Amino acid sequence: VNSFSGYLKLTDNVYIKNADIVEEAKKVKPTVVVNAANVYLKHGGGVAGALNKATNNAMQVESDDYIATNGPLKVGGSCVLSGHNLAKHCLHVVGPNVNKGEDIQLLKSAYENFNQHEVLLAPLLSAGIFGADPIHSLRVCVDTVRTNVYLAVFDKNLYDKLVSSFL
Numbered sequence: 001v002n003s004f005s006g007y008l009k010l011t012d013n014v015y016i017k018n019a020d021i022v023e024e025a026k027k028v029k030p031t032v033v034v035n036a037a038n039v040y041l042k043h044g045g046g047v048a049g050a051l052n053k054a055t056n057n058a059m060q061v062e063s064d065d066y067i068a069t070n071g072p073l074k075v076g077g078s079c080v081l082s083g084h085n086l087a088k089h090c091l092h093v094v095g096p097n098v099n100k101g102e103d104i105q106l107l108k109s110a111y112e113n114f115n116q117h118e119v120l121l122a123p124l125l126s127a128g129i130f131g132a133d134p135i136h137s138l139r140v141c142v143d144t145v146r147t148n149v150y151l152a153v154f155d156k157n158l159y160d161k162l163v164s165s166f167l
C-alpha cells in the first residue's frame with residue numbers, strides 16, 4: 001500500500017491521474033519524483049520549471065553544481081538529485097525533445113531509467129512542449145517501465161484523450 005489517491009489503473013504497474021505533478025508531490029512526498037529535464041538541467045519551463053519554482057530555485061542551484069562537476073546528461077539519460085521539499089529524491093530524466101530535433105527512438109531509453117526505482121511519481125515523458133505524440137509516450141511507458149509508476153498528466157483534455165484511446 002502507498003499514499004497515491006484517485007489514480008486510474010492502466011496496467012499491473014502503471015497508474016494515471018489528471019493532476020499537477022507539483023501539487024501531487026507536495027501532498028504525497030513520494031520517495032521519487034521524476035523531472036522532465038534537458039541535458040543542461042536548465043529548469044526553465046514545463047514540468048522542470050514548475051518543480052524548480054516550487055523548490056524556490058533550490059533545484060536549479062543544486063543542478064548547476066551537478067553540471068559544473070559532471071557535464072551534461074545524455075538524451076535518454078538521467079541523474080538522481082535531491083527532491084528538496086517535494087520528494088526524497090528527484091530523478092531528472094531527459095526524454096527527447098522533438099521541437100529541438102532530438103531522436104524520438106531515445107524515448108524507450110529515457111523510460112528505462114524508471115526501472116532503477118521501485119515507485120515513482122512521473123510526468124508523461126516527451127509530451128507537451130517536448131513535441132512527441134503523447135499517446136505514443138504512454139504506450140512506450142507501459143511497454144518499458146516494470147516498476148510502479150504514477151503518472152500525473154497536467155492537461156485535462158489530454159488526460160481524457162489518453163484514457164479514452166489506451167489499448
Ligand SMILES: O=C(O)Cc1cc(Cl)cc(Cl)c1
Nearest residue numbers: 036046127128129153154155
Ligand atoms: O502533463 C501534461 O499535460 C503533458 C506534459 C508533459 C511534459 Cl513532460 C511537459 C509538459 Cl509542459 C506537459
